[PDB]
A paper describes a structure:
CK1 isoforms phosphorylate many different substrates bearing either a canonical or a non-canonical consensus sequence. They are involved in the regulation of many different cellular processes such as canonical Wnt signaling, DNA damage response, cell cycle progression, apoptosis and chromosome segregation (Cheong and Virshup 2010; Price 2006; Knippschild et al. 2005a, b).
Selected compound 5 was screened over 442 kinases identifying 5 as a highly potent and selective inhibitor of CK1δ. The sidechain conformation of gatekeeper methionine 82 is more compact to accommodate the trifluoromethyl-group but no deeper/selectivity pocket is opened. Hinge residues leucine 84 and leucine 85 are hydrogen bonded via the backbone carbonyl to NH and the backbone nitrogen to the imidazole nitrogen of compound 5, respectively. Hydrophobic interactions exist between the trifluoromethoxy-group and the sidechains of proline 87, leucine 92, phenylalanine 95, leucine 293 and phenylalanine 295. These water molecules are all solvent exposed and should therefore have no influence on the binding mode. According to our predictions and X-ray models, the tested compounds are not occupying the selectivity pocket.
Numbering used by the authors: 2 to 218, 220 to 295
């Protein structure tokens, strides 16, 4: 039996994290399960304390995981969080890697709002991907949460709101599959890039895979092939067979200037108007609704 924080029983691994994997655990006192993130202290660049600080700054926002405890204990840095439900990637697989339009639009609405919230607190996320959105549990089972602040960083000064400077020659940060075109080009990430990535996530959900997925290969040619393919795929080819709003969303995000504040409301309204034009009911009945978590 393994214990951390003189309070939590450590269980088995439930997932990966940017830096440190995630384990199920039990809060022995409260008789409740929790999620426990562990980072090895001999890791080359320890990050967990920084990440926990970001979670603390995000607290109180809708769809932000609650921190219960953080501390170092011997060979591990430990972060204990409220347990959440499955990831959108888990649920996508459950659903045979295709979501209905209704589900994609219900998800888009919340996901835009999560990103907007992180931006409002002065950070960019930098790794918007299905694995980093989790559904809640119980009464919050239809709430989408955003997680993993391991790659996040400030994009503006907290007092003046002066934007970070434009620069280039940046190494890739985040998943190549969902990176913005400017991220592939080595441009410093900013708010538009989180939103562009979300655009690719929504098309991934619509399509089942993206055109730059499953390319094969030095240091390496794989990322270069992804970048080249993504950069040369016409939006209208990517989005063929799906409502025009998906291409409108992507063109909008791509046209944002480096320091522009995105019109989040416009983007949410694009999808909401479509939702209601289609005559969907906003009843939070997702494709996985037969699962009762
Ligand atoms: O990861 C889960 N919880 C979780 N709560 C967290 C709280 C904070 C953090 C943080 F990042 F440290 F902040 C991470 C967390 N991770 C979780 C709960 S259930 C599950 N996975 C399936 O049920 C499933 C797996 C594979 C295929 C299908 C799956 O379920 C379902 F429902 F999709 F079919 N994963
Ligand atoms: C909180 C409910 C328990 C979640 C169980 C889902 C576990 C499946 O998911 C996973 O567990 C694997 C082994 O099972 C690990 O090796 C992987 O890191 C992880 O993807
Ligand atoms: C309580 C009943 C819910 C059963 C949840 C099990 C979901 C298994 O999960 C999955 O679904 C498919 C079938 O294995 C596969 O295509 C996916 O890759 C796999 O991840």
């Amino acid at each position: 039996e393994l214990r951390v924080g003189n309070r939590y029983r450590l269980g088995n691994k439930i997932g990966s994290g940017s830096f440190g994997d995630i384990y199920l655990g039990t809060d022995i006192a409260a008789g409740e399960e929790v999620a426990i993130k562990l980072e090895c202290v001999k890791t080359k660049h320890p990050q967990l304390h920084i990440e926990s600080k970001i979670y603390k700054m995000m607290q109180g926002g809708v769809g932000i995981p609650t921190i219960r405890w953080c501390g170092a204990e011997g060979d591990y840095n430990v972060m204990v969080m409220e347990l959440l439900g499955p990831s959108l990637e888990d649920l996508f697989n459950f659903c045979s890697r295709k979501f209905s339009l209704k589900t994609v639009l219900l998800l888009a609405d919340q996901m835009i709002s999560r990103i907007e919230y992180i931006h409002s607190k002065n950070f960019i996320h930098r790794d918007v991907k299905p694995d980093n959105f989790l559904m809640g549990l119980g009464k919050k089972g239809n709430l989408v949460y955003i997680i993993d602040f391991g790659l996040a960083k400030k994009y503006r000064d907290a007092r003046t709101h002066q934007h970070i400077p434009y620069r280039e020659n940046k190494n890739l940060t985040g998943t190549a599959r969902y990176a913005s075109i400017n991220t592939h080009l080595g441009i410093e990430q900013s708010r538009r890039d989180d939103l562009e990535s979300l655009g690719y996530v929504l098309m991934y959900f619509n399509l089942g895979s993206l055109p730059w997925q499953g390319l094969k290969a030095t240091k390496r040619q794989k990322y270069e092939r992804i970048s080249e393919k993504k950069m040369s795929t016409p939006i209208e080819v990517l989005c063929k067979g799906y409502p025009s709003e998906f291409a409108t969303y992507l063109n909008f995000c791509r046209s944002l200037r480096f320091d522009d504040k995105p019109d989040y409301s416009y983007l949410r309204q694009l999808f909401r108007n479509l939702f209601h034009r289609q005559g969907f009911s906003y009843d939070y009945v997702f494709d996985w609704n037969m699962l009762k978590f």
